[PDB]
């Protein structure tokens, strides 16, 4: 199992006309596999949607993925911006 | 490392034959020397002065030469043509 493969490639034709949105070298970088989209980085480790307790067929349409991601409440953020100045 | 040795430059004869310095021994900011101006502890800054890269470029390496009740003073003149 090797480590030092290249795994990125560049085509010789300068097509740099409509490409300011992609990832440029500074040309266009062309990798050997796709990307990986990760929804939320921090798992919410309790929350019986995920913990599955052993007590007591049901569906639930939760709002967004933001339930599973430890977001702070806004009153603390306003308190901290008041503590800013 | 990065330290200048303490000796081994004797650029004196080229200033004797510089023809800008008014030395009568031979015939054939806005300051000039940084003896009042700091250089913020880089020696490379002293290479901006035009009489000092003269003594690093045109210098050489020298080897050190090694060695009554009333004084009577006598003046001695010296006048020799040579080449």
């Amino acid at each position: 199992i090797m480590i030092d493969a290249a795994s990125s490639f560049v085509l010789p034709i300068s097509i740099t006309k409509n490409v300011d949105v992609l990832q440029r070298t500074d040309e266009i970088l062309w990798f050997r596999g796709p990307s990986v989209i990760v929804n939320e980085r921090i798992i919410n480790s309790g929350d019986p949607h995920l913990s599955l307790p052993l007590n007591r067929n049901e569906k639930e349409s939760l709002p967004g993925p933001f339930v599973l991601g430890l977001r702070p409440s806004a009153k603390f953020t306003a308190h901290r911006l008041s503590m800013l100045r | 490392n990065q330290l200048i040795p303490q000796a081994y430059i004797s650029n004196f004869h080229n200033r004797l034959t510089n023809e800008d310095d008014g030395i009568p021994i031979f015939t054939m900011g806005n300051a000039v020397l940084p003896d009042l101006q700091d250089q913020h502890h880089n020696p490379f800054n002293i290479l901006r002065y035009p009489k000092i890269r003269d003594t690093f470029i045109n210098g050489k390496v020298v080897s050190p030469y090694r060695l009554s009740g009333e004084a009577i003073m006598i003046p001695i003149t010296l006048d020799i043509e040579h080449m």
């Binding site: 030092d4 290249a6 490639f9 560049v10 010789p12 034709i13 | 490392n1 990065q2 020696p43 490379f44």
Partner: peptide
């Protein structure tokens, strides 16, 4: 376009780790 072999970018591991960024240490004329 299907005959357009691409150029590998090699990383050369010792370049990736610790490369810094000689006359500017004044001891060598």
């Amino acid at each position: 376009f299907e005959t357009m072999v691409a150029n590998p970018i090699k990383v050369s591991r010792l370049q990736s780790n610790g490369v810094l960024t000689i006359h500017y240490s004044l001891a060598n004329f």
